[PDB]
Symmetry: D3
């Protein structure tokens, strides 16, 4: 009535904001042309029983949609690579992942987040850290959470 | 086309600081049946000076705070405190050091207070003074206050708190 | 579990970590004896007109001892000095105060340190809160608040919560 | 020289700066117009072997100069009041001060600082908190240290601000 | 005017204040000659099939000089070491890279310190912004971003802004 | 002892704040190359393989699931595993490899079970002290900033086996 909480930008301060981003990643392995490929197959290709033996390198350019249907509203790509890092895994596989997200659509059109984290696919919820970012996401500090082709993503990141 | 939302840091356990604009009118009633201030102790050179408040006078006050400049508007709080005349020249362009607190009555900040110790020359249009601290919703306050001018002053208060 | 992790002070990397300190003491107000700790410093001009023991516009000066416990015998660890002003024109017995006082501790870690306070004191309130407006000593750069507890020659329980370095 | 340290405002951040202010406060009692008057002596004047009994109130307008000589460059004035909070003894007076510093001349022209704290005049060094400030000292969190050298006390002021 | 004031560093009172620094150097990617600065550590499986020189899934590993000025003969600042991968299925000339690399600095105050980087990179875009993911040495707790500028062998202009202590 | 009792210094969580902590972590990384059950693989050979004189030629790519123990013995209490990759990145180097690594420590045991840190940095294996940044974390280690410091306890520079000791300093909430 006689008071309002305003933005520190009024007095010229650059407060940090917390931003929750939601989207779906589609790693597509079957199709006329898919989205990820084996950049270098694992030396134990012949011996392991795993479809992706220890030490496979995969690179990927997965689209990011607003909802779980593939033809949902595109908002960005996830580009980068993962690497198979569980010697014992056969199907329940474990990955280290180095991907960046690039967004197109809205405030964050052009802004990118970077990730490097450990993803053990069998887990219901999988947590990797938001390493940093560009554009609006400069000075990013945060994490993400992937549930599970198409994976639900929940990103929380501090920036300005 | 909205895959994002700027959530509050409280969602993750953090307690970010906030900036609040407070706006209200202060009523120094000097004449009438019960006035709002009184001269708790007078300057030992009262008759000598042509000033109504010779250097070294001490007024105590209790001025109501209203949403609008009419005294009848919604009363949101009150200023209590004192001030000291601090210019020797003086006469009518008085200079005061004021120590005073604001209490509020209703709203988010029902019951919270703000304290201020500062300096104003009444003759100037903008007078700035600091928010030295606060209680309640205004714990840990740090900010400033801008006053615009039997009397009614316009107050703009910018506070950081949590 | 043998343990391979411990939390350390940010001191070890040269940072000056902000600490929150909880200070607990009793403030005795001796109105008896040949040396009272308080005094009306400037009575109100409406002294005779009003029925209050301390009418609108009175000014009190105080020099009160601070002890670790509620008995005066307990360790003297400080002293509050300052002043306050009655700021209710209505009040007869339900006084409203503005206080400008500073706590100087003579005690342990904080011997020589001070906290300053300017705030409001409704004397009907069972728990009254005032803000820590700044400090010196270990209490340099202090931000915080303060809570005084007492119902209506006595004493008063202080709990202080003050961030500093 | 392939690298250089830049201020955070290049990226639009409002970084906090630590400022050291040096000046001399002049405490004039002798002469045709001094700088402090006794606004209210205590009800224990004669009953006290003391020039300022417990409970005296003094109001002050003191000039702040660059050097120790009243003639040196004038940069501001201290205004406010202080209250004698020590009983008996005397010469060993202890005072709680509420004053503000208003600065002329400089990048801090028209800016103020506020102080409320405890002055044991005996002490060689006396420390007091900077409780808030205005102008360029909005949100000031700091302290000052006064060194006891008519009088002229050396002040050294250490203020965080934006 | 005789100035009565001065700004100090907060370390005068013990604090370890954030610092923001600009670093400006040139990175040279010699892809041609007797000794280049990178090699194709793992060729992409779709070599014959793709038209681009560096097909999706290629891994390059680099150890590139950093100079203060754009001539390779310029004063040497440090190394950029690391890897990148081509992350665009359709690109033929307008490639897209996810890059992972470090900068060792042998120069002045920052001798021995490192910064890390992991981000996107559109080779043909004029301004290429990548995050500073962290750092060692003086750049512990590094936080920032970096901008690379080139044109439609090589040398690329680098401007990095980093917060640290 | 005495006059010491009226002040107590407490967690700013008592007032709802989430103060950042500084955590020191100490473990031993075990780099097993030779023998029947090793923790490494050369996911891709350097094209320099035949020509170069280094055991791990420039442009090799390794992938590792190294174990983390509290003490120097491999028999010691297992506290985590390090997983990821690195690339050889010095062309002059023969024995004194230069590595760029990207890797994650997942911890099993105690306060930090399931929490990860992630690391991307240079390490110059011959240095007596190798510093590498902590680039982010998860679980209890969300919003992590910090750095490692690895020191070689035992090491064979021809066969590649190592017992490295790590000391990580990380800030978080």
């Amino acid at each position: 009535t006689y008071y309002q909480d305003i933005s520190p930008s009024f007095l010229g301060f650059k407060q940090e904001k917390l931003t929750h981003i939601h989207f779906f990643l589609h790693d597509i392995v079957t199709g006329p042309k898919p989205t990820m490929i084996i950049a270098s197959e694992s030396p134990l290709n012949g011996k392991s029983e795993s479809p992706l033996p220890f030490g496979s390198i995969v690179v990927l350019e997965d689209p990011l949609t607003v909802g779980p249907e593939l033809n949902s509203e595109l908002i960005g790509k996830a580009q980068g690579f993962y690497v198979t890092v569980s010697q014992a895994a056969v199907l329940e596989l474990e990955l280290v992942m180095g991907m960046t997200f690039v967004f197109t659509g809205g405030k964050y059109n052009g802004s990118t987040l970077s990730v490097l984290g450990r993803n053990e696919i069998i887990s219901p919820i999988r947590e990797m850290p938001i390493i940093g970012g560009t554009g609006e996401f400069r000075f990013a500090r945060g994490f993400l959470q992937a549930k599970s082709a198409h994976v639900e993503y929940n990103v929380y990141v501090f920036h300005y």
